[PDB]
């Protein structure tokens, strides 16, 4: 799976996967280290731009993250990697064969905790070093001392001590020697989170029912308990501006703020992160500010603030609700269709299976936006009618764009799923365009196309018909009928001259278009599954059904090349920008590059995760593919 | 943001410092009694003489005010300034101003209060510095020329914009203005804090407790549609209802009663919450007036809840509590009342609780069923409870007596519930 | 008083002046090495000076029929309209209707 033309670059449109992110002050300012599978990305916490990206993809996923001033520690499969500015500065392999769950760094010591209840301690060689490397010792949790380890903490002012919160009790170790100096009495629930408070001695433990226990460690006794009934607590953070507040983040998405001076409940925030993909996995108050940063496995990262009171003297009895400062995101579900918008290879449309169409940016990953669906006022003087509780359009399964009239009328056509028209979208304003394009014989739109000049949009259906519509006016112009089974690809020449359509009855029909004659009818073996046309050279490629690619010269109207060699069905494929190669990805998890002069395969990559779209950039620097699992787009360079 | 707007907020900070002779006549000529020119001609020593006389009059009427003569109304208080003092000192001066405004909110139809608080207005600028406590104190007089005056001087805070429209006018503010003040929400939080402080320092009276009642009623009425607004206004009124109950003034307790009644008939509250409502009500019930009102209230709450669990027993503790507070002859004369509030659901919940927890007053049970006209499913529940009681107990004479009462009325239902269990 | 005691934490001996961040712990201009107990007490007071001590930690702990009950169950429950009860009676003025 080493290749000879394409090499992998990065994976656009991922923000978090649900490992609890880590934060790091740097001076007066804050950064946010999130991990995306096998990488970690670092965001300016004030304005959320993408500062850094982990340099090489780690061998497995990242289990734990922690950060400090300039350094950030990721604990993947067995090892701990210390990175500074992204680049790997120390490896640290733990002498075992069991994965590293948790990780806490305090002073001289790094503390890693495996899954078979053991604690490895790595100590700095001399405190003029900047991160620890000597193996020190290995503290272990025998099952009579506690359950499984849940987290590692180090409370303030505790000299050489480590607070190990297990599933039944809290232990205190004296990590320099390592004698278990203290055990707590067994909690009658399961402990799920722990987090240290900005008061002394006190760790806040969140159990599996709605119960947060403020537990005082020097005395060893609980001082408070707080009951949410019927929630699963999954985050705890202590607002430290000076107002004594708490944010418990449940594992249903609620984020509930308590006021601990007045024993009240300030607020709730409901569905800020999705119930299915995990809820609120981390939710932290930045140290010193009225700002909370929350992040969840639905690929999104959010920031909420507190405005001050409206009332002059009464002050902190009138608490303003916390509103929404800023955020990034991506798709929740894996993507469905991608297409380069423009011919500088800047922007990329991509529709995803949570029905949402993002437009990503390849240069700066703050320019990426979601294309909104807020309909226009119907042009007839009537009422547009849908369910009043709103939901996103059905999954966008074909998509075709032209940049030739951008700004004056719409220029995307999308074809949704189990739905009988297409929707014109915009790209300048980034919004649903004002026309919807029917098919006029009750047949689900199976494929769409747009003219070069940007005036006309063809909508092939699934009962054979072809309808052609003006896009400035959304108004129906022509309608051919030649196929009888489904119509799976449409195309038009750059001189607005010859139209090609390929349909499951194994027919490629060629039409003239200025006048309306039928110019030819070619018949193949099998059903025809996809058409890609290539314009400058008038050649196109039909992915047939019998596991073959057939290249046809759209002028002399005959089959010029026949590329065999695949083994399962062909998912998607694309001509080069210069007309010379085909990249084609097929359901046996391969991607092959074919040369059309010599008519034969010149490259092939075997992929661990099936590729389901493949698209060159138009200015031919990159190849963007997209895969069956994992929310992103994988970007590849071009050694040619 | 602009230089203009940052300068504006600077001027708001230094809003009470006399930097000029012109500004000083502006500040000093705002006053509660006099007109502008006369007020700006006279000086602090004269205003203090008038104020000390008036506070001696108020000390005669109400004897708490000698402490203020010790600490805010002295010759030293002629001398002090408000802007030359560090923040700890300012906080204490605002504690004393807030406690004064409480302990003479209740006398604001009196020229002595006009004169004494006029010294506080002029020497300490309460009409600029702590206006929210000024307005929340003297709020309920909203027709008396005194409140029209206080509006005319004050500069309205961010939560009193309705009056911000009505300021400087010969017409007064109107009832619908007061309801729309309260129908915003963060004001309800603010006012609740003012009432907690008022309760805890024990200065309440029928006039203002009526006014706060009438506004909490009217807020629930206007929000009677938007169920999200209602559901989010539950904790604030029910916090006040609890604290206002936990007080010891019968007026407080009657106000809390009427708040609970209106709120539960506007929103269907959960069973556990109506149970705890009853728990607090009874557990601090003493007075005669409150006893009558509380009885009406509990009957109305239980009539409101409807679903499953509709007509069950009270738990042991609440039942025993109710018996301590209320005699069966008292509930019997209540059922002997002429007007007869609809109380069937509470009556049968009480009856099932008797027959499952006391097992003696079955003569009283027959008395109750003679008194009131229950409904068919209440009959069914009571008769089945008695059937189980018979099968656990000796077939006693009074249990028999109850049975032939039902035989007098509905042999057939006795037969139907018997077919459910028995012969 | 506490519920554990650390023999090495008292017998240890720590320097101060070697680091800017902790030169400010000293009481004299002479001391350079303190033992662990006084280091930990200085350090606790500095933590106090960073994050000042509130009321909720310190002044308040959790420790016929009551009075607090209405407020307590309000604290517990979060959505107070009874819905979950199979209400059997169609509630008034807001209809619940779905188009098929």
């Amino acid at each position: 799976k080493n290749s000879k033309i394409f090499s992998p670059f990065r994976i656009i449109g991922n923000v978090s996967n649900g490992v609890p992110f880590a934060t790091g002050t740097l001076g007066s300012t804050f950064y946010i280290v999130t991990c995306v599978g096998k990488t970690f990305q670092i965001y300016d916490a004030n304005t959320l731009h993408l500062l850094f990206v982990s340099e090489k993809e780690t061998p497995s996923s990242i289990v734990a993250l922690s950060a400090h001033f300039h350094y950030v520690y990721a604990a993947y499969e067995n090892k701990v990697g210390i990175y500074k500015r992204g680049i790997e500065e120390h490896l640290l392999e733990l002498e075992t064969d069991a994965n590293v769950e948790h990780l806490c760094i305090f002073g001289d010591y790094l503390c890693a905790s495996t899954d078979d209840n053991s604690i490895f301690i790595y100590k700095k060689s001399d405190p003029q070093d900047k991160y620890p490397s000597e193996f020190y010792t290995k503290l272990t949790v025998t099952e009579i001392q506690g359950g499984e380890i849940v987290s590692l903490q180090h409370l303030a002012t505790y000299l050489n001590k480590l607070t190990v919160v297990t599933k039944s009790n809290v232990l205190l170790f004296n990590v320099r020697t390592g004698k278990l100096v203290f055990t707590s009495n067994e909690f009658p629930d399961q402990i799920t989170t722990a987090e240290p408070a900005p008061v002394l001695d006190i760790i806040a433990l969140g159990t599996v029912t709605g119960e947060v226990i403020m537990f005082n460690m020097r005395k060893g006794k609980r001082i408070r308990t707080i009951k949410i009934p019927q929630s699963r607590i999954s985050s705890l953070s202590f607002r430290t501006d000076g107002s004594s507040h708490l944010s418990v983040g449940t594992s249903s998405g609620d984020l509930i703020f308590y006021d601990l001076d007045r024993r009240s409940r300030i607020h709730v925030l409901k569905n800020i992160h999705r119930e299915s993909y995990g809820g609120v996995t981390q939710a932290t108050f930045l140290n010193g500010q009225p700002i909370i940063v929350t992040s969840g496995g639905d690929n999104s990262l959010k920031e909420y603030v507190f405005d001050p009171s409206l009332s002059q003297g009464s002050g902190d009895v009138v608490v303003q609700p916390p509103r929404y400062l800023r955020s990034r995101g991506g798709h929740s579900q894996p993507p469905s269709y991608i297409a380069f918008a423009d011919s500088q290879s800047h922007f990329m449309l991509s529709a995803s299976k949570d029905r949402s169409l993002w437009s990503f940016s390849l240069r700066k990953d703050a320019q990426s936006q979601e294309m909104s669906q807020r309909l226009h006022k119907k042009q007839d003087g009537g009422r547009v009618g849908g369910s009043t509780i709103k939901s996103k359009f059905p999954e966008i399964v074909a998509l075709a764009i032209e940049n030739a009239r951008i700004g004056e009328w719409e220029n995307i056509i999308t074809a949704h799923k189990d739905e009988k028209f297409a929707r014109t979208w915009d790209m300048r304003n980034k919004r649903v365009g004002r026309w919807t394009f029917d098919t006029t014989d009750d047949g689900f739109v199976k494929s769409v196309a747009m003219s070069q000049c940007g005036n006309f949009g063809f909508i092939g259906s699934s009962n054979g018909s072809i309808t052609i519509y003006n896009m400035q006016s959304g108004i129906l112009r022509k309608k051919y009928k030649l196929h009888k089974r489904a119509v799976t690809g449409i195309s038009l020449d750059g001189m607005n001259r010859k139209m090609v359509s390929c349909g499951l009855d194994g027919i490629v029909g060629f039409y003239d278009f200025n006048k309306s004659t039928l110019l030819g009818k070619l018949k193949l073996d099998a059903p025809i599954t996809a058409m890609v046309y290539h314009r400058s050279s008038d050649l196109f490629a039909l992915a047939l059904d019998d596991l073959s690619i057939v290249v046809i010269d759209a002028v002399t109207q005959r089959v010029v090349r026949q590329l065999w060699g695949h083994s399962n069905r062909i998912t998607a494929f694309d001509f080069s920008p210069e007309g010379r190669w085909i990249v084609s990805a097929s359901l046996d998890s391969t991607i092959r590059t074919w040369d059309l002069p010599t008519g034969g395969c010149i490259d092939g990559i075997i992929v661990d995760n099936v590729a389901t779209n493949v698209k060159f950039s138009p200015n031919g620097d990159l190849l963007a593919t997209t895969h069956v699992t994992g929310n992103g787009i994988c970007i590849w360079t071009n050694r040619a | 943001s602009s230089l203009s707007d940052q300068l504006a907020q600077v001027a708001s900070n230094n809003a009470t410092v006399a930097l000029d002779r012109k500004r000083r006549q502006k500040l000093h000529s705002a006053s509660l009694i006099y007109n502008s020119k006369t007020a700006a001609t006279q000086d602090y020593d004269f205003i203090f003489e008038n104020a000390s006389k008036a506070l001696e009059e108020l000390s005669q009427i109400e004897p708490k005010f000698a402490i203020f003569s010790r600490t805010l109304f002295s010759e030293s208080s002629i001398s002090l300034d408000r802007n030359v003092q560090t923040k700890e000192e300012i906080k204490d001066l605002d504690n004393a101003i807030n406690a004064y405004l409480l302990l003479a909110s209740s006398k604001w139809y009196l020229a002595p209060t006009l004169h004494a608080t006029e010294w506080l207005v002029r020497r300490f600028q309460i009409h600029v510095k702590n206006t929210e406590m000024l307005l929340l104190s003297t709020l309920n007089y909203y027709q008396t020329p005194v409140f029209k005056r206080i509006l005319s001087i004050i500069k309205l805070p961010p939560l009193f914009n309705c009056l911000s429209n009505f300021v400087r006018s010969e017409k007064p503010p109107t009832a619908l203005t007061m309801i729309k003040l309260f129908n915003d929400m963060d004001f309800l939080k603010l006012y609740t804090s003012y009432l907690d402080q008022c309760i805890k320092h024990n200065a309440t009276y029928t006039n203002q407790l009526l006014f706060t009642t009438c506004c909490f009623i009217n807020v629930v009425a206007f929000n009677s549609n938007n169920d999200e607004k209602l559901n989010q206004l539950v904790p604030i009124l029910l916090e006040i209802s609890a604290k206002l109950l936990a007080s010891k003034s019968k007026d407080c307790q009657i106000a809390a009663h009427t708040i609970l009644v209106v709120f539960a008939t506007a929103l269907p509250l959960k069973k556990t919450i109506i149970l705890a409502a009853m728990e607090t009500i009874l557990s601090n019930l003493d007075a005669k007036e409150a006893k009558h009102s509380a009885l009406l209230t509990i009957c109305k709450l239980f009539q409101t809840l409807k679903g499953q669990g509709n007509v069950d027993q009270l738990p042991s503790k609440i039942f025993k509590l109710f018996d301590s507070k209320f005699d069966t002859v008292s509930i019997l004369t209540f059922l002997d009342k002429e007007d007869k509030p609809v109380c069937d659901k509470f009556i049968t919940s009480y009856t099932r609780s008797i027959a499952r927890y006391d097992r003696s007053k079955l003569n009283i049970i027959l008395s109750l069923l003679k008194k009131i006209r229950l409904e068919r499913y209440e009959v069914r529940l009571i008769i089945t409870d008695l059937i189980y009681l018979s099968e656990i107990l000796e077939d006693k004479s009074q249990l028999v007596e109850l049975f032939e009462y039902f035989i007098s009325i509905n042999e057939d239902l006795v037969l139907k519930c018997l077919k459910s269990l028995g012969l | 008083e506490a519920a554990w005691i650390d023999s090495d934490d008292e017998k240890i001996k720590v320097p101060i002046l070697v680091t800017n961040k902790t030169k400010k712990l000293r009481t004299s201009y002479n001391e350079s090495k303190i033992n662990g107990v006084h280091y930990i007490n200085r350090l606790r007071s500095q933590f106090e000076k960073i994050y000042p001590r509130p009321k909720w930690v310190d002044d308040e702990s959790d420790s016929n029929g009551d009075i607090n009950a209405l407020t307590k169950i309000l604290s517990t429950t979060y959505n107070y309209k009874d819905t979950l009860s199979n209400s059997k009676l169609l509630p008034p003025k807001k209809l619940d209707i779905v188009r098929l």
């Binding site: 305090f106 002073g107 700002i291 | - | 961040k21």
Partner: peptide, 28 residues
């Protein structure tokens, strides 16, 4: 008129923080 609710630009003032990397110490 009703009450105005308008959001003001939030800017991040700084605050101190403790240190573990002092918190641990060394034997003799």
């Amino acid at each position: 008129p009703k009450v105005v609710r308008e959001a003001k630009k939030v800017e991040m003032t700084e605050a101190r923080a403790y240190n573990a990397d002092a918190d641990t110490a060394k034997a003799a």
